[PDB]
Amino acid sequence: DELAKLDAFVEGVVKKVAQYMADVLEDSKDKVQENLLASGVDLVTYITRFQWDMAKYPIKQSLKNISEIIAKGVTQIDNDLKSRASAYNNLKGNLQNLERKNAGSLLTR
Amino acid sequence: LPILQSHSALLENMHIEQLARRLPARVQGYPWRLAYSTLEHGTSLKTLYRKSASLDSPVLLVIKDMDNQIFGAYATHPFRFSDHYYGTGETFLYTFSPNFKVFKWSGENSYFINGDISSLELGGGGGRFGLWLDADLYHGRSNSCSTFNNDILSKKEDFIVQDLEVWTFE
Amino acid sequence: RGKLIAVIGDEDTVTGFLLGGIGELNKNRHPNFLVVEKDTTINEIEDTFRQFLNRDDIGIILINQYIAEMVRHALDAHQRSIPAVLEIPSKEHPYDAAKDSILRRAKGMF
Amino acid sequence: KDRIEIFPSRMAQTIMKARLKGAQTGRNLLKKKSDALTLRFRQILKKIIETKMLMGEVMREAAFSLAEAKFTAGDFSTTVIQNVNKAQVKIRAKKDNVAGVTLPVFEHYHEGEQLAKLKRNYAKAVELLVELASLQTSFVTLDEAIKITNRRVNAIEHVIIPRIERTLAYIITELDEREREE
Amino acid sequence: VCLFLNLANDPTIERIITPRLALTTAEFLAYQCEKHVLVILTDMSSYAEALREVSAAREEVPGRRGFPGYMYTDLATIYERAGRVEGRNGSITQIPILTMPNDDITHPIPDLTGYITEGQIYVDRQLHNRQIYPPINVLPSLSRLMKSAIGEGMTRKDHADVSNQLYACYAIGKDVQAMKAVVGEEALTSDDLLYLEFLQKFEKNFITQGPYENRTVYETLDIGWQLLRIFPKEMLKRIPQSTLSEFYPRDS
Amino acid sequence: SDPVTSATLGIVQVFWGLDKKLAQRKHFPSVNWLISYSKYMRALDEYYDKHFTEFVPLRTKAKEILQEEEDLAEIVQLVGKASLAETDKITLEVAKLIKDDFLQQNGYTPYDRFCPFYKTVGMLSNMISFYDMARRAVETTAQSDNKITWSIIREHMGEILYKLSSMKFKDPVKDGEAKIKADYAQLLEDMQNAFRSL
């Protein structure tokens, strides 16, 4: 049960940090997909050649302890994305609002 | 590109460049905040634990001895009291000898970090420690330990701390 | 086993703090709460408060502040710290801040 | 009585001097205990009023949630007040310790969509009620402990120390009288 | 060393003579042979015992608390055979050693000695029972002429500052240690925990010494700085920023 | 106080003082261990170094425990014990073990009519070994979700407390040096095994 819930969270986080990278890069899905990578190789290569990363997620921990390591790491990334995305989006929003006041009526320009 | 610290009295742009290139993906691009410094918070191991007790992120130990040689460790978990070893294999020891060298985990055993009430130590493999510091942060020792397969981190196996900093990535 | 949150007040304020899955009737079938209907005698309010205030089932009593002002005689006389008595709001009323029988100990300090 | 009724001797001087340091030490340690109890007390006072400010929000929102849930469903209050039975949400009684005083506190535990929004908003509200009740029952207990401690400090300063000092002065006087007789 | 021994079963008039032979030798060595002399007089309470015994043989009436009425004049005749004098390079310094009955400082012997001499160093039964040596308590101890002994060209420039800051931290640490059992250590501030760490390290490193261990004033001052470095320099209220700038950091 | 005592203390190298609190609590021998003294200890420490080696540390630690508890015994009259830390409760309760099961001695019963020095060092060695391990268990479990208390140690180790309090009953007329040492050494192993089982 627990891993089945946890997977449906980490998939959500991976999709958020990829979706937001397309928005920050502004252009197109293909140009982003060309640069979706793990360890410096494309997703197909990484999933095909998987070897367990026992520096990060140690093999001799209990299955419950490994679960909590992976949950804490992905939780931190979800939080730090939220902060970094808020902080950058505000600049873009406010700068467009100044352009909307270079534009607009003589009554508000 | 040289990373965004809030200060440092031990390190220099020679050391910050060479360190920022080695730290794990887990901290690449974070600003470095000073958690503890013997030169600002007063010199004791109880203070180093007390200042580290609120953290939940990696730290960089930096030491300067009475020969002015800089060395330390990057540690995946805060320095805290423990009855058993803790930390994970991204932990490493480093030394400016005067070349920058880094001794990443060998794969041999999981003896990364430990902390008694009266000393703090990193590494293992027999009676060996890669780094050991006393309750006063006065005496310390380094030997080759099989967790990292390090050289002697100081000029001498037994050293005296001139000053010490702990940075954290927050 | 635990402890219960007793309630005295308007019928909606007795439905609130109950719909959350809260409050029982004990072995004597006496409920954890009373509705103050518009004709309720001041005795029925203070005597039901006195019954909840001396029942081992209970840890907290919630009382609308306008009826806490009616039971003000027995209520401010409660010097014990065993149960808590809370002078809660109602839809029709100012919120719980003023007069409070416990808070008023700090008579120049809040 | 003005004095402690020991009989004049160098042994009595030794005893009364020991008592005087004991009482002056006891005073100063109990004054410290009063400051320690007072610090926690004024902190939980600020948390009492701050919990009450949060109650001034969420109880209104829960009452609104009940009005909206009733507007959605027709009513609940006619039925659920009569249909009383076993309950799933309750309190555990709990303790804390402060300068050797024990303070009472409480812990919350479990044993149309407007009704679900309602249940969440009343859950928020009762967590503030458990919080306030904990702080207030602690505060009442702690107020009494401050009053008791201050009463002891005043008794050591105004009843006990003067009685020892009068006794000590009498002993020092009678030893000079015995010496003049000799 | 010149050594004069009077045993507990020697004639008691030799005990009256002993301080006077000693100080007559110190006066020759200091004011004629130009030496700096330290005179140690061991158990003045054993001298006062014999002084009372001579007075009783003269059939004189016992004075106050049993001792002779002139005992102030008699002690002052021993103690004031001391000091520097104009035109001579020698000097006499004295350390009278005393034993107090019932550990009571108000007895005539320690009382009258306090009106003639200029300080006291105080040996403590609680430090002795905790197995510390030397068991000297620095709180009731005082040297009244200390300001004239210490400082630049006579010891080191920081001695006046370091002595005052160590005393302050020891006094505060003793107060925190007393309240720790009243409130429990979980009630203590981070500031209180620095003082309670200083207290334990002061008594182990500074006060405790070997009976065959010899420290210069410089080892004494340097052990002082190793303990003051427990605190952030902004907590060192008694030390001026000029002294802290030169001495607080560890040197290479 | 009096002139005969005052004159005597100027001369004698050892003084043993009575405590009326011990005598009126029928604790024997009723000697006060805080006003008494001996000035021979530096002369004897070379004999203890030659013949025992361990005893000088034990004597030292026992006097520390007995003095540290005498300050706690003043403060608990004000605060009623509640504030006291577990290391310090450990220190109260072991001080009592020393007072009742080492310093107390029945003068008429055959097993304690004369306590030889190999029995004397054996008893105290075990009590100080208990103090170290019991205090270490509390201190090592500070800053932790599981924290050891005197009550936990008392619940886990009641047989070791019963054996420690019973160490006095060994009779040097009935049992030889080898048996009395082996019995005390087995208790030291029972202590270590109990602490290793915690």
Residue B5 token pair = 């610290």
Instruction: Say if CB F81 and CB E182 are below 8 A apart.
Output: no
Touch test E–A: 3 Cβ pairs or more under 8 Å: no
Residue D171: other Cβ atoms inside 10 A? 22
- The answer to whether E187 contacts D10, with C-beta atoms less than 8 Å apart, is no
By what method was this entry solved?
cryo-EM
Distance separating the N- and C-terminal Cα atoms of chain F: 52
**Residue appearing with tokens 């040197």:** E251
Domain count, chain D: 1
Largest CA distance in chain C: 45
Cis (ω within 30 of 0) for the bond into E134? Answer: yes
* Chain E nearest-CA residue for F36: E129
F105 is in an annotated binding site: yes
Chain A hits for B26, CB-CB cut-off 8 Å, are 73
Please count the residue pairs, one from chain D and one from chain E, whose beta carbons lie less than 8 angstroms apart: 24
Quote the distance between the C-alpha of residue D179 and its chain's center: 54
Q: What chains are in contact with C, requiring at least 3 Cβ pairs below 8 Å?
A: D
Query: How far is the CA of D132 from the CAs of A19, C56, E48, E78, in angstroms?
Result: 44, 20, 72, 75
Instruction: Say if CB B137 and CB B164 are below 8 A apart.
Output: yes
Q: Is position D5 within any domain? A: no
Alpha-carbon distance E57 to E72, whole Å? 20
Chain E hits for B138, CB-CB cut-off 8 Å, are 226
- The answer to whether F1 contacts D22, with C-beta atoms less than 8 Å apart, is no
| E160 beta partners | none
* Distance of residue B161 Cα from the nearest chain E Cα, in angstroms: 9
The two beta strands, B119-122 and B131-134, are: antiparallel
Q: What is the DSSP string of E93-131?
A: EEEEE---GGG-TTSHHHHHHHHHSSEE--B-HHHHHTT
Tell me which DSSP letter residue E233 carries: G
The dihedral through the CA atoms of B24, B27, B31, B35 has a sign that is: negative
**Residue appearing with tokens 């508000």:** A108
Contact status of A60 with chain B (Cβ, < 8 Å): yes
Disruptive mutation site among E182, E185, E192 for chain D (greatest number of D CBs within 10 Å): E182
Chain F hits for E185, CB-CB cut-off 8 Å, are 85
Instruction: Say if CB B105 and CB F127 are below 8 A apart.
Output: no
F107 is in an annotated binding site: yes
Torsion of the alpha carbons at A61, A67, A71 and A73, rounded to the nearest 10: 30
Write the single-letter amino acid at D93. A
Distance separating the N- and C-terminal Cα atoms of chain D: 30
CA nearest to F101, candidates F73, F123, F130:
F123
CA nearest to D62, candidates D124, D10, D106, D113:
D124
Instruction: Say if CB B36 and CB B163 are below 8 A apart.
Output: no
Residue E179: other Cβ atoms inside 10 A? 23
Q: Residue D179, CB half-sphere, CA atoms under 13 Å: how many?
A: 16
Quote the distance between the C-alpha of residue E170 and its chain's center: 17
- The answer to whether E184 contacts D99, with C-beta atoms less than 8 Å apart, is yes
The dihedral through the CA atoms of D156, D160, D164, D169 has a sign that is: positive
Chain breaks in chain D (C to N over 2.5 A) after: 111
Instruction: Say if CB C60 and CB C86 are below 8 A apart.
Output: yes
Instruction: Say if CB E84 and CB E27 are below 8 A apart.
Output: no
User: Residues of F numbered 178-197 whose beta carbons fall under 8 angstroms of chain D's beta carbons: which are they?
Assistant: none
User: Residues of D numbered 31-50 whose beta carbons fall under 8 angstroms of chain F's beta carbons: which are they?
Assistant: 33
Tell me which DSSP letter residue D153 carries: H
Alpha-carbon distance F137 to F89, whole Å? 13
- The answer to whether D26 contacts F1, with C-beta atoms less than 8 Å apart, is no
Write the single-letter amino acid at A67. S
Please give the residue range of the domain that contains residue D107.
Answer: 10-182
Residue D136 token pair = 């207030």
Chain A hits for B90, CB-CB cut-off 8 Å, are 55-56
Domains of chain C: 1-110 (3.40.50.10580)
Residue C71: other Cβ atoms inside 10 A? 25
Contact status of D28 with chain F (Cβ, < 8 Å): no
The dihedral through the CA atoms of A88, A92, A98, A100 has a sign that is: negative
Q: What chains are in contact with E, requiring at least 3 Cβ pairs below 8 Å?
A: B, D, F
Phi, psi of D94 (to 5 degrees): -150, 160
Alpha-carbon distance A60 to D16, whole Å? 68
Query: How far is the CA of E126 from the CAs of E69, E134, E211, F88, F99, in angstroms?
Result: 34, 12, 19, 18, 19
Residue A103 token pair = 């534009």
Tell me which DSSP letter residue D158 carries: I
Which class for E16: exposed (0-12), middle (13-18), buried (19 or more C-beta within 10 A)?
middle
- The answer to whether A58 contacts B110, with C-beta atoms less than 8 Å apart, is yes
Q: Which residues of E221-247 are buried (b: 16+ CB within 10 A; e: fewer)?
A: beebeebbbbbbbeebeebeeebbeeb
Contact status of F3 with chain D (Cβ, < 8 Å): no
Which candidate from C3, C89, C110 shows the least CB-CB separation from D91?
Answer: C3
Instruction: Say if CB B51 and CB B45 are below 8 A apart.
Output: no
Residue F84 token pair = 């006291």
Which candidate from E45, E46, E131 shows the least CB-CB separation from F60?
Answer: E131
Alpha-carbon distance B74 to B19, whole Å? 10
Which class for E193: exposed (0-12), middle (13-18), buried (19 or more C-beta within 10 A)?
middle
* Chain F nearest-CA residue for D10: F1
The two beta strands, B70-75 and B92-96, are: antiparallel
Contacts of E232 (CB under 8 A, 6+ apart): B40, B41, B42
Alpha-carbon distance E106 to E101, whole Å? 10
Task: Report long-range pairs for E73-81 (Cβ below 8 Å, ≥24 apart).
Answer: E75/E44, E75/E48, E75/E112, E75/E113, E75/E116, E76/E116, E78/E19, E78/E20, E78/E23, E78/E41, E78/E44, E78/E47, E79/E113, E79/E116, E79/E117, E80/E116, E81/E23, E81/E26, E81/E27
Kind plus residue range of the DSSP H or E element containing D97: strand D89-98
Query: How far is the CA of D93 from the CAs of B88, C57, E103, F112, in angstroms?
Result: 40, 11, 54, 53
Instruction: Say if CB B168 and CB B58 are below 8 A apart.
Output: yes
Tell me which DSSP letter residue F173 carries: T
CA nearest to B149, candidates B82, B93, B110, B99:
B93
Alpha-carbon distance C18 to E199, whole Å? 57
Please count the residue pairs, one from chain B and one from chain E, whose beta carbons lie less than 8 angstroms apart: 27
Residue D169 token pair = 């002065």
Contact status of F70 with chain B (Cβ, < 8 Å): no
Query: How far is the CA of A12 from the CAs of A15, E183, F188, in angstroms?
Result: 5, 50, 59
DSSP percent split of chain D into helix, strand, coil, nearest 5: 75, 10, 15
Query: How far is the CA of A93 from the CAs of A85, B155, D119, in angstroms?
Result: 12, 56, 37
Q: What is the 3-state secondary structure (H, E, C) of E154-205?
A: CCCCCHHHHHHHHHHHHHHHHHHHHHHHHHCHHHCCHHHHHHHHHHHHHHHH
The structure was resolved to a resolution in Å of: 3.3
Contact status of F4 with chain E (Cβ, < 8 Å): no
Q: Which residues of E43-53 are buried (b: 16+ CB within 10 A; e: fewer)?
A: ebbbbbbbbbe
- The answer to whether E102 contacts F1, with C-beta atoms less than 8 Å apart, is yes
- The answer to whether C110 contacts D49, with C-beta atoms less than 8 Å apart, is yes
Quote the distance between the C-alpha of residue B57 and its chain's center: 14
CA nearest to E168, candidates E136, E134, E139:
E139
Disruptive mutation site among B47, B69, B161, B164 for chain E (greatest number of E CBs within 10 Å): B47
Residue F90: other Cβ atoms inside 10 A? 23
CA nearest to E138, candidates E190, E206, E210:
E206
Disruptive mutation site among D48, D72, D76, D89 for chain C (greatest number of C CBs within 10 Å): D89
- The answer to whether F74 contacts D99, with C-beta atoms less than 8 Å apart, is no
The dihedral through the CA atoms of F33, E126, E49, E108 has a sign that is: negative
Write the single-letter amino acid at A45. T
Which class for D162: exposed (0-12), middle (13-18), buried (19 or more C-beta within 10 A)?
exposed
Alpha-carbon distance A17 to A35, whole Å? 13
Residue B15 token pair = 């050391």
Instruction: Say if CB E196 and CB E176 are below 8 A apart.
Output: yes
Q: Is position D165 within any domain? A: yes
Residue D18 token pair = 């020991």
Kind plus residue range of the DSSP H or E element containing B114: strand B113-115
Residue B57 token pair = 């992120």
Chain E hits for F85, CB-CB cut-off 8 Å, are 181, 184-185
Instruction: Say if CB D38 and CB D153 are below 8 A apart.
Output: no
Alpha-carbon distance C43 to C47, whole Å? 6
CA nearest to F61, candidates F127, F14, F16, F138:
F127
Q: Which residues of B83-102 are buried (b: 16+ CB within 10 A; e: fewer)?
A: eebbbbbbbbbbbbeeebee
* Distance of residue B139 Cα from the nearest chain A Cα, in angstroms: 31
| Angle between helix F117-140 and helix F177-197 axes, rounded to 10 deg | 0
Q: Is position D4 within any domain? A: no
* Chain C nearest-CA residue for D65: C16
CA angle E23, E28, E33 (to 5 degrees): 140
Disruptive mutation site among F136, F143, F146, F198 for chain B (greatest number of B CBs within 10 Å): F143
- The answer to whether F75 contacts E181, with C-beta atoms less than 8 Å apart, is yes
Quote the distance between the C-alpha of residue A79 and its chain's center: 10
* Distance of residue C25 Cα from the nearest chain D Cα, in angstroms: 6
Write the single-letter amino acid at D153. V
Task: Report long-range pairs for B11-19 (Cβ below 8 Å, ≥24 apart).
Answer: B11/B62, B11/B70, B11/B165, B15/B70, B15/B96, B15/B100, B18/B96, B18/B100, B19/B60, B19/B94
Instruction: Say if CB D81 and CB C11 are below 8 A apart.
Output: yes
Q: What is the DSSP string of E8-40?
A: TTS-HHHHHHHHHHHHHHHHHHHHTS--EEEEE
CA angle B57, B62, B66 (to 5 degrees): 160
* Chain E nearest-CA residue for B9: E249
Alpha-carbon distance F91 to F76, whole Å? 13
| B71 beta partners | B63, B95
Chain A hits for B110, CB-CB cut-off 8 Å, are 58, 60
- The answer to whether A58 contacts B105, with C-beta atoms less than 8 Å apart, is no
- The answer to whether E181 contacts F84, with C-beta atoms less than 8 Å apart, is yes
Chain E hits for F79, CB-CB cut-off 8 Å, are 181-182
Distance separating the N- and C-terminal Cα atoms of chain A: 58
Alpha-carbon distance B14 to B7, whole Å? 15
Tell me which DSSP letter residue E61 carries: P
Q: What is the DSSP string of F8-63?
A: HHTT-SEEEEE-HHHHHTT-SS-EEEEEEEES-HHHHHHHHHHHTSSHHHHHHHHH
Alpha-carbon distance C36 to A89, whole Å? 53
Residue B47 token pair = 């203070």
- The answer to whether F74 contacts D22, with C-beta atoms less than 8 Å apart, is yes
Q: What chains are in contact with B, requiring at least 3 Cβ pairs below 8 Å?
A: A, E, F
Q: What is the DSSP string of chain C?
A: --BEEEEEESHHHHHTTTTTTB--B-TT--BSEEE--TT--HHHHHHHHHHHTT-TTEEEEEE-HHHHTTSHHHHHT---SSSEEE----TTS--S-SS-TTGGGSTTT-
Phi, psi of D33 (to 5 degrees): -60, -40
Q: What is the DSSP string of F81-110?
A: TTT--HHHHHHHHHHHHHIIIII---SSSG
Contact status of F146 with chain B (Cβ, < 8 Å): no
Which of helix, strand or coil describes residue D95?
strand
Instruction: Say if CB F48 and CB F55 are below 8 A apart.
Output: yes
Query: How far is the CA of E220 from the CAs of E95, E133, E206, in angstroms?
Result: 21, 16, 8
Instruction: Say if CB D91 and CB D109 are below 8 A apart.
Output: yes
Alpha-carbon distance B66 to B161, whole Å? 6
Contact status of D32 with chain E (Cβ, < 8 Å): yes
**Residue appearing with tokens 């809260």:** C22
Residue E236 token pair = 């060192």
- The answer to whether C20 contacts D48, with C-beta atoms less than 8 Å apart, is no
> Where do the H-state alpha helices sit in chain B?
13-20, 45-52
* Distance of residue E237 Cα from the nearest chain D Cα, in angstroms: 23
CATH code of D96's domain? 1.10.287.3240
